[PDB]
Design a protein around this nucleic acid. Structure first.
Ligand SMILES: [Mg+2]
Ligand SMILES: [Mg+2]
Ligand SMILES: [Mg+2]
Ligand SMILES: [Mg+2]
Ligand SMILES: [Mg+2]
Ligand SMILES: [Mg+2]
Ligand SMILES: [Mg+2]
Ligand SMILES: [Mg+2]
Ligand SMILES: [Mg+2]
Ligand SMILES: [Mg+2]
Ligand SMILES: [Mg+2]
Ligand SMILES: [Mg+2]
Ligand SMILES: [Mg+2]
Ligand SMILES: [Mg+2]
Ligand SMILES: [Mg+2]
Ligand SMILES: [Mg+2]
Ligand SMILES: [Mg+2]
Ligand SMILES: [Mg+2]
Ligand SMILES: [Mg+2]
Lengths: 109, 139, 191, 195
RNA sequence: GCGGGUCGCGCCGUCGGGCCCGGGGGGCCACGCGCGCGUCCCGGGACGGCGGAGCGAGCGCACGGGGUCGGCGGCGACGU
RNA sequence: GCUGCGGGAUGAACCGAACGCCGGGUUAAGGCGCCCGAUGCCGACGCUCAUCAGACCCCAGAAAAGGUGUUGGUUGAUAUA
RNA sequence: UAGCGACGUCGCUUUUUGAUCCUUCGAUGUCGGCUCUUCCUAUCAUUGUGAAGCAGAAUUCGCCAAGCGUUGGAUUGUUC
RNA sequence: GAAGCUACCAUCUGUGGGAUUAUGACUGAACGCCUCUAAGUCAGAAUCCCGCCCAGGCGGAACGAUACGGCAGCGCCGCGGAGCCUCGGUUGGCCUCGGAUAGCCGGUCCGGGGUCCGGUGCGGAGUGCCCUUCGUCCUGGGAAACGGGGCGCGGCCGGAAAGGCGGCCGCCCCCUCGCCCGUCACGCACCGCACGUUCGUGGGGAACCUGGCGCUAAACCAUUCGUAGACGACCUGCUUC
């Protein structure tokens, strides 16, 4: 039992004012509020978790409604602890304001 | 009101900056917004720091106005600022905050077991005492 | 230029006994008690002296406007101490032309009712402040005396009377008619 | 999940900014006591600005055009509309996440209420500046419900005073209990590791 | 009485000329003793052609070396 | 004109900079309360309250004159008689 | 200096006229009147005020102020 | 010349509160005097806003009736058995007011004063609590007199703003491990790997068997009216006396 992943809210895309850059995402990640604080979270992995009415899985036991898009943290972004991220497939852009799991994958202690 | 105002020779804590956690003594006020501070024994070298940087406390000394490092050290050692500093609740709070930051997982495990045992003893004896208070106010 | 600690010195005499709970000042004396609220002024208030009752009013830093502010607290505490010992008395001789002015006190000293006012038919009912009494004085032609404790309330009442008696649509260099404040003083004389 | 924010002594634009950024990320925020929000500046200029805003209207059909809300909760809600991208179908979900209440509702009588420190009058305004009351402004301009809200606020403050004495009674009992003994087996470990 | 060039005096300086010369730890991509090739120096050092003289060979390697490969490993059917 | 692109909200001409299609990194002109990416710096120093404040080349409205509103500064005249 | 104010001087306005030709010449129906709605204020009257060389009256000059009024007719197609 | 429609060509009715501008003041410094201003206050209007008066929103209330006949049908309660869709969160907060040139906590006195603390907040939301709990058996030490769960039963009511959660008591079948320290041995050890744990016996719709409690309507049209109508819409009538 227990949650192993840290909580993070998808804030939007890397962008200028006019045009976006859809191959990269930004993540406001809770508990992190400084450029110095967002150094532990480099190299970690991120996963987006959602539902769909077809029934498709991975070795997690049995067929589920659940689908997951993977990716990983690249670098820090700004002073406010916000974190750039690159996924294998780009975001649906439905998930602005929906929680993306940041896992304790590549721990480097 | 305003129990603690600055002076020539009042000790001060440095909250934010390159000297977090280190006492200084105020030598003199330059102009309204910064002042010259100095630490003989708390390992901080004579320099000018702003007032919103520093945090005031309640111990004073007796300095000549703008004295040297020598006389600052003499009054420091003769007043015994360090031991008397560690023997206040303020430094106990700072010490506890540093220990809580420097915990580990096994420490948090022991903290949670002792926390459960204490809160259960509190819960039982509080329930018994307020039941006894009801039984006291019942006649 | 961001000065420092300007301080005003307010003596307090022996009869009155002062007590403050903050910037709210409460003064007790022989002629009732009194209080004001100095909340919006942000000035250090402190008193010193075992039964000598020295008050100091102290403001640090500030500006030139706030160094102007720090004397106003001193002056209002002075006026409250004058009031709670003595009380304020305003003597008003009514100046009338060919028409008389009749002035009655209608109920309990509070209401003042002015009549005949240059031959105007309109009865002029003026309501005074709470905490102030008014009487038509004796041994003098149409002198009206207002007595009270708070000088702001008493002088606001006197201003209400003299702006109740105001001549419209005429010269006001001729038609010099109204009820005007002639003398400011204390309740108990020789003090 | 729900950020229940107090409104006494906050500033309009600052609190609108912080609520507007937090509402786009998903944390459902509720602004309670909207009548006690202070507006910086002299309130004669504040009623002058809002009164000219009332003057701004369509001359061809006043039903279609600038709706001028008079209730203070709706004033704050329009201010947050002006800061969220509401014409997009992002900000419309954001405004549907945002709730606001003049007065205090019965869930929020008892739910604990946060206070934003970056928007306080005490932090922002140099003390010799003049401020406003949005309750004063709304009572001057068309919001006819001050006399009800004042009565309900007196009532709920009276109920909160009867709750606080009970809670302080419980804390007196538990510190009498901690003045009693046999908790000290654990407290050495606890003080070593931050009591 | 001042300046411009020359000459000679001592003192500077992890100075330069790999300087020099004889005596009384550290660095170096610097190696055939026998004796005989010319010079320089006080029998020895250094070079070009020769008197010594780079003996013997690539063996097995290791590779911050002409842009990466595993002689690494997992998980899933009758409806995905 | 024949020309997109990043800023100046909005633009032909402005300021950077010129274009094959892409992945990473850096910047320019500009900007960092929220729309809207970035100051969510325990930023440094002062000035100003406006009952019509002020807020950025081109630029999208203002002068002569006046203020014991405040803040500096210059030159004189007094004050230990 | 109540009210005006020359000699000079700095502005504002687009309700006069002028200058220009930027838009439309494969068409924007051109004067004035009738009716009808709304707005501005650089206020003629009314509300509230101040100043007069304001005794009263009647006036004149200012300020907040466009809420509400600002007509009936002879002539000329008229705006005037 | 009826009825009706109609006329400033007949008649009737048309209303108050608040903050404030201009201005006049008061107190009072700056500037030891003065001053309507610098902080404070007052009077103050055909303006402004609201009241009075019109229309009531993708605004919300309280209440009524809630589908026979011959099976039905449909509600509240307990369910269990399948099956489609929409998608998000992976411990929870159960609450003083108010101030910042001040405030919090503890205590004889007649809500106040005096007194004792604490304070860059530790009676601390940088903190608090069930909580880092994998379960079970064995077996001992501390803690433990309330249990603790509830199909519970029955009573009380606390809460008006947009209330259904919160608590007490008496009874009922069980737990004396409902938490810490210690002894002991197994449980799928699925043989390096993700979408795991959750508030979920989530939310909505179609139906299927089941026990118990109940219920047996109302619109709209057709018609009629005319206080109302272009058409709709609107006002109404239609008991066998
Ligand atoms: Mg006249
Ligand atoms: Mg061409
Ligand atoms: Mg070209
Ligand atoms: Mg170009
Ligand atoms: Mg562009
Ligand atoms: Mg622009
Ligand atoms: Mg464009
Ligand atoms: Mg790129
Ligand atoms: Mg730049
Ligand atoms: Mg942002
Ligand atoms: Mg000036
Ligand atoms: Mg042309
Ligand atoms: Mg033309
Ligand atoms: Mg055409
Ligand atoms: Mg045409
Ligand atoms: Mg046309
Ligand atoms: Mg009009
Ligand atoms: Mg009519
Ligand atoms: Mg005034």
């Amino acid at each position: 039992s227990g949650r192993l992943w840290s909580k993070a809210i998808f804030a939007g895309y890397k962008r200028g004012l006019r045009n976006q850059r859809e191959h990269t995402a930004l993540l406001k990640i809770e508990g992190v509020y400084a450029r110095d604080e967002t150094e532990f979270y480099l190299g970690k992995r991120c996963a987006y978790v959602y539902k769909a009415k077809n029934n498709t899985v991975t070795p997690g036991g049995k067929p589920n409604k659940t689908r997951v898009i993977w990716g990983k943290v690249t670098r820090a972004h700004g002073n406010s602890g916000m974190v750039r991220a690159k996924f294998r497939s780009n975001l649906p852009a439905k998930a602005i304001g929906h929680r993306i799991r940041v896992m304790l994958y590549p721990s480097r202690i | 009101v305003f129990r603690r105002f600055v002076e020539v020779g009042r000790v001060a804590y440095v909250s934010f900056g390159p000297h977090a956690g280190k006492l200084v003594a105020i030598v003199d006020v330059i102009d309204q917004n910064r002042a010259l501070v100095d630490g003989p024994c708390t390992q901080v070298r004579r320099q000018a720091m702003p007032f919103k940087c520093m945090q005031l406390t309640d111990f004073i000394l007796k300095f000549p106005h703008s004295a040297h490092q020598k006389y600052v050290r003499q009054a420091w050692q003769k007043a015994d600022i360090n031991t008397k500093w560690a023997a206040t609740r303020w430094a106990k709070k700072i010490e506890a905050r540093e220990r809580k930051a420097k915990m580990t997982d096994f420490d948090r495990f022991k903290v949670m077991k002792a926390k459960k045992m204490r809160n259960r003893i509190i819960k039982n004896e509080v329930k018994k005492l307020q039941k006894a208070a009801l039984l006291k106010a019942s006649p | 230029m961001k000065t420092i600690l300007s301080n005003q010195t307010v003596d307090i005499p022996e009869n009155v006994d002062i007590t403050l709970k903050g910037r709210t000042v409460i003064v007790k004396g022989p002629r009732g008690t009194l209080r004001r609220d100095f909340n919006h002024i942000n000035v250090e208030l402190s008193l010193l002296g075992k039964k000598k009752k020295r008050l100091r009013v102290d403001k640090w830093w500030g500006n030139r406007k706030e160094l102007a502010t720090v004397r106003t607290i001193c002056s209002h505490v002075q006026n409250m101490i004058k009031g709670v010992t003595l009380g304020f008395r305003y003597k008003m001789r009514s100046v009338y032309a060919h028409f008389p002015i009749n002035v009655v006190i209608q109920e309990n000293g509070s209401l003042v009712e002015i009549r005949n006012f240059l031959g105007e038919k309109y009865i002029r009912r003026v309501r005074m402040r709470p905490g102030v009494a008014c009487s038509v004085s004796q041994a003098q032609k149409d002198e009206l005396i207002l007595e009270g404790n708070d000088i702001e309330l008493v002088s606001n009442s006197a201003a209400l009377i003299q702006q109740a008696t105001t001549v419209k649509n005429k010269d006001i260099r001729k038609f010099l008619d109204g009820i005007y404040v002639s003398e400011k003083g204390t309740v108990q004389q020789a003090d | 999940q729900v950020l229940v924010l107090d409104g006494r002594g906050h500033l309009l634009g600052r609190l609108a900014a912080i609520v507007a950024k937090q509402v786009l990320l998903g944390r459902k925020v509720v602004v309670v006591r909207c009548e006690g929000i202070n507006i910086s500046g002299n309130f004669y200029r504040n009623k002058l600005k809002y009164l000219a805003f009332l003057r701004k209207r369509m001359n061809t059909n006043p039903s279609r055009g600038p709706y001028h809300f008079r209730a203070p909760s709706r004033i704050f809600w329009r201010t947050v509309r002006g800061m969220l991208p509401h014409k997009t179908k992002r900000g419309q979900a954001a405004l549907d996440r945002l709730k606001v209440f003049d007065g205090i509702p019965p869930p929020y009588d008892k739910k604990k209420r946060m206070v934003v420190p970056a928007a306080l009058k005490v932090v922002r305004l140099k003390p010799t500046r003049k401020f406003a009351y949005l309750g004063r402004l709304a009572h001057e301009v068309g919001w006819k419900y001050q006399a009800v809200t004042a009565t309900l606020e007196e009532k709920r403050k009276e109920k909160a005073k009867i709750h606080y004495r009970k809670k302080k009674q419980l804390m007196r009992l538990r510190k009498q209990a901690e003045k009693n003994v046999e908790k000290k087996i654990d407290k050495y470990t606890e003080v070593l590791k931050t009591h």
